[PDB]
Amino acid sequence: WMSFSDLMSGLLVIFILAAVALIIELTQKSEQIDASIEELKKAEEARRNILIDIKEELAKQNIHVEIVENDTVLRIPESTLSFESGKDTLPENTTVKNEVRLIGIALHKAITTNERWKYLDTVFVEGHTDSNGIWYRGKGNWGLSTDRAVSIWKLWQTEINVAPKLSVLTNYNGQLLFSVSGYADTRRVDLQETTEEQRARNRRIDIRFTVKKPKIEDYEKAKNV
Amino acid sequence: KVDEENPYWMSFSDLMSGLLVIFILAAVALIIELTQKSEQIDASIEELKKAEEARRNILIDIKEELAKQNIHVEIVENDTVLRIPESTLSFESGKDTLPENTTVKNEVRLIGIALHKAITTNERWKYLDTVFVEGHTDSNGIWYRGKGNWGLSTDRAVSIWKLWQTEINVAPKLSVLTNYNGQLLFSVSGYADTRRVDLQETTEEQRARNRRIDIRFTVKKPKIED
Amino acid sequence: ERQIELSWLLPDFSHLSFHPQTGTALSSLFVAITLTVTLLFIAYLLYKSIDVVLKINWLQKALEPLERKDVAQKKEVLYQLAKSKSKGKSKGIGFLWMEFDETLVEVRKGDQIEIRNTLDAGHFFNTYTLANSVTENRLIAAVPGFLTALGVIGTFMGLQLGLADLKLGAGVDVTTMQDGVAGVVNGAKIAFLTSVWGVALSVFFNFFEKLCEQFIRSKIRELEDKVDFLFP
Amino acid sequence: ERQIELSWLLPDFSHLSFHPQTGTALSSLFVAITLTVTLLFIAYLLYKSIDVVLKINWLQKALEPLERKDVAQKKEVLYQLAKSKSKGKSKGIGFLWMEFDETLVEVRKGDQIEIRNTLDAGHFFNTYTLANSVTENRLIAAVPGFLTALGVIGTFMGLQLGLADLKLGAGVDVTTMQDGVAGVVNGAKIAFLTSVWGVALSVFFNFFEKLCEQFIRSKIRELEDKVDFLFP
Amino acid sequence: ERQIELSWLLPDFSHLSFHPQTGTALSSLFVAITLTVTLLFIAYLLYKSIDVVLKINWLQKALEPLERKDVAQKKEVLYQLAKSKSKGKSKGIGFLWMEFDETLVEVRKGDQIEIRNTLDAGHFFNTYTLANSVTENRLIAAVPGFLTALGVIGTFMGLQLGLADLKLGAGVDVTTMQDGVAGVVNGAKIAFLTSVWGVALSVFFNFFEKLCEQFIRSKIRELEDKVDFLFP
Amino acid sequence: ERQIELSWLLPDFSHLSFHPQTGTALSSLFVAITLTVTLLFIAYLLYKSIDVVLKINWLQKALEPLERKDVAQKKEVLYQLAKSKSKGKSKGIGFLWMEFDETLVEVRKGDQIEIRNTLDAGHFFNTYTLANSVTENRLIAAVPGFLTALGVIGTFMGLQLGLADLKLGAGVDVTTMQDGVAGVVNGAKIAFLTSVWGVALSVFFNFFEKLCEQFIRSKIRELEDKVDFLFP
Amino acid sequence: RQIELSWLLPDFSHLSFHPQTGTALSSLFVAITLTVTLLFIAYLLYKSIDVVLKINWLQKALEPLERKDVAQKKEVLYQLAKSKSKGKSKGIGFLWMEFDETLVEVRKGDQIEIRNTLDAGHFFNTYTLANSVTENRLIAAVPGFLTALGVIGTFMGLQLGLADLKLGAGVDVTTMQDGVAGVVNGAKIAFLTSVWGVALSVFFNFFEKLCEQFIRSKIRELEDKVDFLFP
Ligand code: NA
Ligand code: NA
């Protein structure tokens, strides 16, 4: 038994080496899988980094925008960007025109930084109005909110000198990135909407960012086999 | 007789066997960690596979419900997009209004009724992230009071959206429907000619393939964090 | 608490062969060999143990209905009972009474017949004479070592079968490493199944062998007590 | 850093059963068997050891009033006193005094009766004639090995049972793997707990047995020197 | 149930040399050495036990055709033919008869002229005088320890040389050390093969030499049967 | 070539107690017991060896100046010296020397006076009479087994206590399971330390006891070398 | 994987009693194990040459002997038995003294050939020639000690290997890889100490029993000489 116990001790050492070597490989395979799980959340990470980039970059220029709706929408309040009442054109006060160029430049720089458009599906320029019914050539607030989003999107095309144009940027799938939306007063942020300071919170331009979603193969590859 | 055999040497082989099993559990514990990671990913694949089957069942029943009513719609983009061609839903040239023959607008109603019924059947909006009502035009540059195809394509999607808001009576309106979260299910937007299905633009029917209404369905993210 | 099943300790003897292809076939082969070795050596130990016991037991029946007063005329009545059973047998129980009789001396009282000895009965009835075949049997004393080392061979073979199943090195998938660990578990089950039977059978024989020794010694002292009581 | 309680080593004997179904039930039964084996062998040891001590104690009790010059006036009464307890007793202490008596040769030291022995008293009062049942008892000397091997049997039994429920292989889920680990730990609990008691009871009997022999040999030497003192 | 492979139990002995370059070659050499040592000691034990058996058989064939009474005429005619073989030996079976044939005394019971021994023949014909170099030979008793130890040396040498190949450290590349550990585990199975063979041959020799001993004493006692039945 | 820390092998005895609350304290207590048991048996062995040597050297010093022609006229001085060292005791070497004298008888060689002996110096100066509990002590010979047992009990207790309260099973999270399993593996070196000390002290004591036996026996032979030289 | 058996030989140059490395510790064990073997080989040889010297004298002092010297050597052997045994009442002479003093004087014919009454076998055999090497409890324990020394090296090697092995949560690969190196370092101690501990145990055990059979070879050769010389 003296030699048997010595022999069994030798077996224990060999199995200890195998167990720790097995654990070393299994451990590394875990961070491989863990890293792959973090890669599946990178599109939402890229979206959040775009919005923080726009807000921070414009904040250094005294331009207030808001990140809203679960860090998905860049809200441009009427205090920042105000259209003429009942009109889709910004006023000729030679400042809002300057004001809106810097938002387009900020929007461009945040999307093209780190090529985060590879995680974007569509960016929507959304026009929103208050409940005040107007006529507006018969189109109502539905045509007003749509025309304001087109008005903003046209200015971001022909009055900012960004080398990769906003109208040229593609998305994760290779199609063009931007879309234009109008929702009239059907997506109001303020429901009571009594005072003029509450109606004004509904008159806004919303930049909605939609990201690409992982496919089946993205999850199958994350198993790291 | 003085010297007895030392009987406790055998206990060390006993000890070594037990120590062997302890180190087996050290490696087995990692096996379970890796196995749990694989089941967590497998849970997301099956959850996403269920959401994608809910997507295509929505599209098959919209097409089949509309097919019985002589309304032809297309399922394109790998069981993801409901395409309403110009042969089905034709807008007046350069305008977002629809013809006043009382028959075209009835089809638009029936598409919305079929669309609502497929989403609300079997609670399938719980698998959806967003349903996109998509306005698309051809590459022909137009004025449209200075808005161009961006104004026209968005207006056409809105006019369909407004028709579904007032002229169909579904108990939860399409504009009230929510996704797997509490967020609104539907998005309405125009794309001008930026996302054409036909690129060479040569003939009229090739250009006519671009003037369309797309209804794009996106499914929920399976939330790998289990 | 979880339930356990002790039938996992039982080998499967239905498919025994000397060409095992699975771990359970190999462990049941080792247990069968160890059991067969155990059974054969128990039979051999019992064959020579019962020989001694029956050899002693005949005297006990021959001395049962004897008292202090009747030994005078039982000297030769017991002589033919010993003679009939001592046909050619050299140094068994029959010849020991033949050797014992000549060493009996009569007491000088003259009247009444009383019998004594010129030497103690230890020199006539002891382990060296009645059971020297089992007490010093060195093959018997080595049997627990045989069974122990048979289990040790099964232990080493099983564990190094588990060593062979291990799939190590860089670039090995989890399923393959999982299968290697299952092979290690499979080999360890062979090792522990053969060990538990090897040790248990070794202890059983070791205790049974030394129990037989004490039982025979208890029977020899019974002769020593009874013979010397009747023959001071 | 982790706190330990030594009471965790005591098994629960409240639910002892000869068909254990859980790990603790089997480990408790296994320790109960090991305790029972230890207690039975201590009873076997003490049964024979006390038999030796009483034989020595009485003859010591029959010699302390005796001094060198009072041996002659007390030599014969001891022979009758030895007959007093020796009804039979073929190899008892009373009989051991018998054979010693006839070997005490008589010499005349001028005018006072003095008794000498031609041999040494150790030839009649030693372990062979007083404690042959405990000193060279191979069964008793093997008890520490039995108890240690019991604990070893519990290890291979416990480890085999734990590993038998550890199911690996493709398709086995986390719940099944997680339950397999619990069974393996339960098997390891059986293994180490039975080794704790197997070895502790072994070394306890090991020490207790050889403490009894040293105590008995001390009294045998106290017997040899006193008899040598009285009978030069 | 996993399949197992056992063909690796048999080493390849074709490329045997005393300068092994690999662990497989080193394992094969030690198994061959242990086999050769086992065969050398089996032949030594087997040849030198047949020598003992032949001496016993020679005299048995000289006493087989003798009844109880035809011993007076054979008392001396057997003596002359003993000398024809006894010449040259030191303490052979011939001289062993010489020292015993002379010490028979001739008893005269009138017309009952017979032959009788004066003491027990246990120190004249026994395992000491015939089996002087097998039963008490402690070199032969040490062979199974040698065989196990050579297997142990071969295994630890195989394990040690497997480890010395390892370029290892915390600063060494992980993939390098995964391959190094894999080679160590693979070589450990081959290294432990010598211990399996060493223990197996140790058990086989242990069993064999105690079997020959029990066979030798079977005839020595069988020889004493003829001596105590024809030479009272 | 990485560094090893042997100081970790020596546990801290600053807070020893008989109620260990951690595995480290349990390990330290068992190492302390194994060391304490080792020292007590070494101290007893040294004490019972020094006294033999010291009391042998008293007779060596007395016998050192003697010569063959000196013994005749010097005998009575030693008996006076023996009675100066022995005041009436029946145990010391002085009592052994005086009991030796009666065995010395006087021979006649021409006209000179030269004394002989009837018995041998080994009858009065041997291990039994001089170093009784130093040589044939089974308890001392079992101490290496005790040390081995005590060390491995500490390891089994450490391992069992590390597993005793582990919450495992399908209702337990994987992270909790890995913490419990890792704690057991990380604590193995703590429990194993007592086995290292138990084996090391077992081997040291076994070697130490057998050296003292040879040293005492060498002094016995030297004592009876000079006694037989001066008293043939 | 190519092996070299020279890797089994340790480096004894920088030996010390405070080993800082696994190689130094294993070298120390092999040095102690080798040292124990050499002293016990000398202790075995020293107590074996004395047995041979006793036997040698009866062979190297009886060279002028022939068959025709049955009696006139008997007396002259007596004072040469006392020549070395200058007052010793023991030793090889004491065996001769009892054998010489128990020889009956026989009378056959004119010549005076002497005959024995008992064989010299029981007087000049093992239990009194070589009792210091055949029943020596220390020598018998040497192979077990040598093997047990290797087992100590194994246990210390295993314990040193576990000393730096850390597993579980919060342990990265580099720390675990350092644990592999420590286990390997301890394993090299364990395996090397067992190689030498058991090999020297074998060498001593076989050497010890080669000396014994050589002792019987001289005892028998002495006995065979006496048998025909002294019937
Ligand atoms: Na156990
Ligand atoms: Na070692």
Author numbering:
A (entry chain B): 19 to 243
B (entry chain A): 11 to 236
C (entry chain G), D (entry chain F), E (entry chain E), F (entry chain C): 4 to 235
G (entry chain D): 5 to 235
Pull verbatim passages from the article behind this deposition:
Using cryo-EM structural analyses, we show that the Zorya type I and II core components, ZorA and ZorB, assemble in a 5:2 complex that is similar to inner-membrane ion-driven, rotary motors that power flagellar rotation, type 9 secretion, gliding and the Ton nutrient uptake systems. The ZorAB complex has an elongated cytoplasmic tail assembled by bundling the C-termini of the five ZorA subunits. We conclude that Zorya systems, on their own, mediate protection by recruiting nuclease complexes that can damage host DNA in vivo, leading to population-wide immunity.
ZorA I-ZorB I from Shewanella sp. ANA-3 and ZorA II-ZorB II from Sulfuricurvum kujiense DSM 16994 yielded protein samples that allowed structure determination by cryoEM at global resolutions of 2.2 and 2.8 Å, respectively. Unexpectedly, the C-terminal, presumed peptidoglycan-binding domains of the ZorB components, are ordered at the top of the N-terminal helices with the domains dimerized. Although the arrangement of the ZorB peptidoglycan (PG) binding domain dimer with respect to the rest of the complex differs between the two Zorya systems (Fig. 1h(iii)) by a ~35° rotation, the dimer structure is well conserved (Fig. 1h(iii)). As for all other such complex structures solved to date, both complexes are presumed to be in an inactive state since they show no open path for ion flow from the periplasmic to the cytoplasmic face. By comparison, the Zorya complexes are blocked via a collar formed from periplasmic extensions of ZorA TM helices 2 and 3 and elaborate ZorA periplasmic loops that pack against the ZorB subunit (as also seen in type 9 and Ton systems). In ZorB I, mutation of conserved residues proximal to the putative PG-binding site (H186, L199, R203, R254, and R259) causes loss of anti-phage activity.
